[PDB]
Amino acid sequence: WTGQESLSDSDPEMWELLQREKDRQCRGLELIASENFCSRAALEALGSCLNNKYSEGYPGKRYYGGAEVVDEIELLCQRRALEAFDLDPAQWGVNVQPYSGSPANLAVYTALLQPHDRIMGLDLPDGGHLTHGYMSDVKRISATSIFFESMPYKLNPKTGLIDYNQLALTARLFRPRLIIAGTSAYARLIDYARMREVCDEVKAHLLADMAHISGLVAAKVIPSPFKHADIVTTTTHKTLRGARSGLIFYRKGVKAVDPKTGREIPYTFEDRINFAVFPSLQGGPHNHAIAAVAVALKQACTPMFREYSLQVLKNARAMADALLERGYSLVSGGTDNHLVLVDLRPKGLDGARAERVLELVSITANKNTCPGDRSAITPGGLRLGAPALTSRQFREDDFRRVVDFIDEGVNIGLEVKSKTAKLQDFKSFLLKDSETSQRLANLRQRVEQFARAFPMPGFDEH
Amino acid sequence: WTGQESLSDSDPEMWELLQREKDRQCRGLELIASENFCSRAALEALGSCLNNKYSEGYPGKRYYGGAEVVDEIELLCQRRALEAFDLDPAQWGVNVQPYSGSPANLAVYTALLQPHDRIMGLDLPDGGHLTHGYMSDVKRISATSIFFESMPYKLNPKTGLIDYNQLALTARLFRPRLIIAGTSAYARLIDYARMREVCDEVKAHLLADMAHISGLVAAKVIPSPFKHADIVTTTTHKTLRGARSGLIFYRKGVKAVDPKTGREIPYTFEDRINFAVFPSLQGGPHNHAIAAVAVALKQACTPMFREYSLQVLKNARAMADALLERGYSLVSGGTDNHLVLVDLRPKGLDGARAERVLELVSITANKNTCPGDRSAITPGGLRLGAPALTSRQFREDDFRRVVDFIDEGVNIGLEVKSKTAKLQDFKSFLLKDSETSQRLANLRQRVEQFARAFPMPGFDEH
């Protein structure tokens, strides 16, 4: 045994599963707004010998030696991260060690807040992320709500936007120490200037969690959260198109100067953010991930990536405009970003029904809660995203064509719904009924033929 | 841009960094007890298209669709995990999603304990891990000690062993809800049965954190903590020789049938452990890592891996014996596992000095506190481990040869100590002094010539 044998030779069972998954990704239409397709360059770094190195600590301040190269990789991943979002090294530092986006958020809270300190984030059904705080009536769901005290801020159910007025009303009562500006499922831009007004008034920190939009921010196709935010967290995946990992950007240097004291009052984020990641929360850095992130961060600095990002926005608008023109309602009436929230209630359907039908024809999207949701349990919408298929060289016409493929699925969903009682019965009907089955089997076959012809990033067979 | 370019062409700067690290690993003698060299098979899964899938939730209970293949991968990784450790699926379950070892531990505490509930782990300078609790005289350092209340237990400095008597004494007073059996720097086998008695007495959960020894446990070359623990956490790297990730094993089924009532009492770990990992702490699984772990767990079931693990013990013994023969002192007198704790104080040198000299001749080990010494004093010991070099096919003679090189390094360290006063003098004298610089260069070249000839697991170039 050398440990230099191929995966295909040494573990055929696993190799076939990778080939089955690679086939699935190629043949399908990926409309999940959080998914993308990572470059081969990044994945090569991700499966490198950098997996074999323990480098607890930070560049120049490690616990073990033999860390000369990984220091250069970490410092390069930092520099490239700052470059990718056009940040001055004197004003911003960055931590590249978080294992994902959820760890990066917990690290920020741990760094800046005492246990049980107060956090405000967009409510989960209103398009927020679990890690911004989430409790049900019976239990604390997110660990953010266990170790800290979270109160959600809501959407205006008329405009479908973030009610910035009610945020400011509740924030001055609840008195949070941190407010989170970021979203999982929201088609519009965030008023980071307004967020900072509220955070300034009530003496709170502003955290921008740009996970979903980080590529769009680097490409400068939408406005930057870095103009108004104290702290920015992100996934390195999603629109950035990197490996699964996380970043924490923080302000550094001088914040303010008081004329009375006659001196500079520095930002105190750096040491606390870094200490919270390590030694407080994480163990050994995943240097292979850090290197794969740095590969993607270089890619994001290029003209190529900007044109990809402009094409994401166009393809979202094209998917939005095409839905409107085929009789669909959109939450907030459209989009200014990579995704579209389709209210299926005004076309007499829900999200759960649409999801399972589309899935069966190799179209993967997720159900979504809309402001107009009459029922709290069964969600009445659909989140569709551009980034993935755009990375496969999809243009507007291709996106108009997937809308037509979707519409055919929705229209099967509307037909199966009217010949059905429950959501349990709705799934029994799709699998069993030959006329629905074969009409899906035909739609799948077309979707797969349409999808397969487009290029796929990464390796050829896995 | 296809995203199918090679890293070498795509990002030459990153490619040259990977190549330097590969050279450093190949030419070094890796004696860090936490290190290993991952198989190419495992690293191929790690840099696969599985990075592209979001599969929040668990197999058959996902939040998105299109997860049929990743479901099979996660279920396969679970089966192979239970098989590697010879566990009955009726009696044991396993979560394969933790992003690393430290996340796996935090998920356990989150799952079973309330904030501020009490944990006891082996003190950090006594050889426990940061995640078991650590506070300095003025600051909570580990997140375990921020969100929960940790009190350490200590070694008996006479024997270098865990003082099981004092643990039982202090546990009756402190009343921990959870006690952690597991170590980072400990040469001996833990008395899990005695840990169990103390836990049964004070009504505490026993957690076995077997990160360092997991491969030895899988190979059945040392006793298993699964015979006495409620929960077992581990890394998937270190002695298991996989990609960086974590596992949480837990009892399931019937705990004990109460004969007074008559009814069976169930274990209630499964749902709580799984909920803590997701949705409470983590987001999307790292399916690429999960698949790599599945490859490594498969490797760990084979005769090959048992022979590897026996060799790791023999090589550590051989290194211990070879150190004893050259007049070195070992903490606890020797070893029953993969590592050796050298006490350098008797020979008139410390761990900080030795570590840096050894680093400059391509031998990577780490300094370690000896029992009795306070943590504020410069550590007088050195931790050395067999697994990494054993994976490069080192045998007993080769480790004796390794001890020759270490001894030379120590002797160089002794000579530089007599010519300098402080640590910053010692460290700089190694770089600046001509005679010392030459002697190190000679030794380095001999170490590197020796190391390069042995095979290296992984890819050829990176």
Ligand SMILES: Cc1n[nH]c2c1[C@](c1cc(N3CCCC3)cc(C(F)(F)F)c1)(C(C)C)C(C#N)=C(N)O2
């Ligand atoms: C898992 C998750 N993390 N962050 C999320 C989610 C979403 C989500 C959360 C949740 N919940 C988290 C715990 C229980 C509710 C449920 C659902 C679903 F699909 F069942 F409706 C969806 C979704 C992106 C998957 C979700 C929705 N809808 C939103 N808005 O943000």
Ligand SMILES: Cc1n[nH]c2c1[C@](c1cc(N3CCCC3)cc(C(F)(F)F)c1)(C(C)C)C(C#N)=C(N)O2
């Ligand atoms: C980082 C870590 N996590 N878990 C550990 C450590 C060790 C460790 C912890 C620490 N500390 C963590 C916070 C400050 C002390 C310091 C040192 C050293 F090398 F500086 F002495 C070593 C070591 C394996 C690296 C360490 C030692 N010595 C032990 N016993 O276990």
